[PDB]
Design an enzyme around this catalytic site. Structure first.
Site, PDB file in Angstrom:
ATOM      1  N   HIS A  36       0.853  -1.231   0.000  1.00  0.00           N
ATOM      2  CA  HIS A  36       0.000   0.000   0.000  1.00  0.00           C
ATOM      3  C   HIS A  36       0.875   1.263   0.000  1.00  0.00           C
ATOM      4  O   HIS A  36       0.454   2.315  -0.445  1.00  0.00           O
ATOM      5  CB  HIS A  36      -0.882  -0.097   1.259  1.00  0.00           C
ATOM      6  CG  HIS A  36      -0.068   0.076   2.518  1.00  0.00           C
ATOM      7  ND1 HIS A  36      -0.013  -0.900   3.502  1.00  0.00           N
ATOM      8  CD2 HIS A  36       0.698   1.117   2.981  1.00  0.00           C
ATOM      9  CE1 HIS A  36       0.759  -0.426   4.497  1.00  0.00           C
ATOM     10  NE2 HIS A  36       1.219   0.798   4.230  1.00  0.00           N
ATOM     11  N   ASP A  60       0.715  -7.967   0.497  1.00  0.00           N
ATOM     12  CA  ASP A  60       0.957  -6.497   0.684  1.00  0.00           C
ATOM     13  C   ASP A  60       2.455  -6.218   0.868  1.00  0.00           C
ATOM     14  O   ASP A  60       2.852  -5.488   1.758  1.00  0.00           O
ATOM     15  CB  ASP A  60       0.175  -6.108   1.945  1.00  0.00           C
ATOM     16  CG  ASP A  60      -0.190  -4.623   1.890  1.00  0.00           C
ATOM     17  OD1 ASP A  60      -0.832  -4.225   0.931  1.00  0.00           O
ATOM     18  OD2 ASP A  60       0.175  -3.904   2.808  1.00  0.00           O
ATOM     19  N   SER A 118       5.888   3.091   7.730  1.00  0.00           N
ATOM     20  CA  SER A 118       5.657   1.728   7.155  1.00  0.00           C
ATOM     21  C   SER A 118       6.794   1.374   6.196  1.00  0.00           C
ATOM     22  O   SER A 118       7.262   2.208   5.442  1.00  0.00           O
ATOM     23  CB  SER A 118       4.329   1.819   6.406  1.00  0.00           C
ATOM     24  OG  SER A 118       3.875   0.509   6.094  1.00  0.00           O
TER      25      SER A 118
END
Ligand code: ZN
Lengths: 165, 4
Positions: A36, A60, A118
């Site tokens: 993402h 992901d 992230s």
């Protein structure tokens, strides 16, 4: 191939996309991050554009071919629950491991503080990578625990397929 | 929450 290729040592590099910015870690000569954040798209780093090496929408997670002259992080080999997360603002938040891919936050911080982290790698006090931050868990703007992917998952992703046409 |  006589090239100076002079660069500063840095296992973690700054990676950004056309929507948000985040950090990535190079393990075993391969860069790693969440889908993402980067996704199966070109990544613009300090060197310039980056080619895609691995991609996994289901997990992901995506990876880029690490250029030569790059460092790598070894996996965690100490059984230490405590973990250190590297934030884009040069801040380290002690996170206690509470599962294979689940951890808890000792200091309750706003979700904005963890945003932009992230893809960053988590290193145990010994000095080895343990996984990468994927998302934070919060109730009302405050995150009390975080989730990360262990380095073991990377071995299965590459072993399953090498993204070769 | 995804951060990314
Ligand atoms: Zn370790």
């Amino acid at each position: 191939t006589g090239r100076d290729k002079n660069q500063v040592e840095g296992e973690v590099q700054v990676v950004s996309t056309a929507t948000q910015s985040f950090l990535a870690t190079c393990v075993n000569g391969v860069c790693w991050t969440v889908y993402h954040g980067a996704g199966s798209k070109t990544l613009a780093g300090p060197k310039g554009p980056i080619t895609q090496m691995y991609t996994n929408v289901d997990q992901d997670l995506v990876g880029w071919q690490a250029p030569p002259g790059a460092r790598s992080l070894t996996p965690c080999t100490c059984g230490s629950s405590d973990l250190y997360l590297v934030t884009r603002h040069a801040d380290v938040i002690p996170v206690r491991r509470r599962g294979d891919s689940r951890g808890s936050l000792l200091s309750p911080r706003p979700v904005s503080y963890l945003k932009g982290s992230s893809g960053g790698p988590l290193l145990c006090p010994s000095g080895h990578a343990v996984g990468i931050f994927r998302a934070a868990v919060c109730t009302r703007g405050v995150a009390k625990a975080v989730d990360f992917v262990p380095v073991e998952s990377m071995e299965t992703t590459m072993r399953a397929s090498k993204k070769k046409k | 929450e995804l951060x990314x």
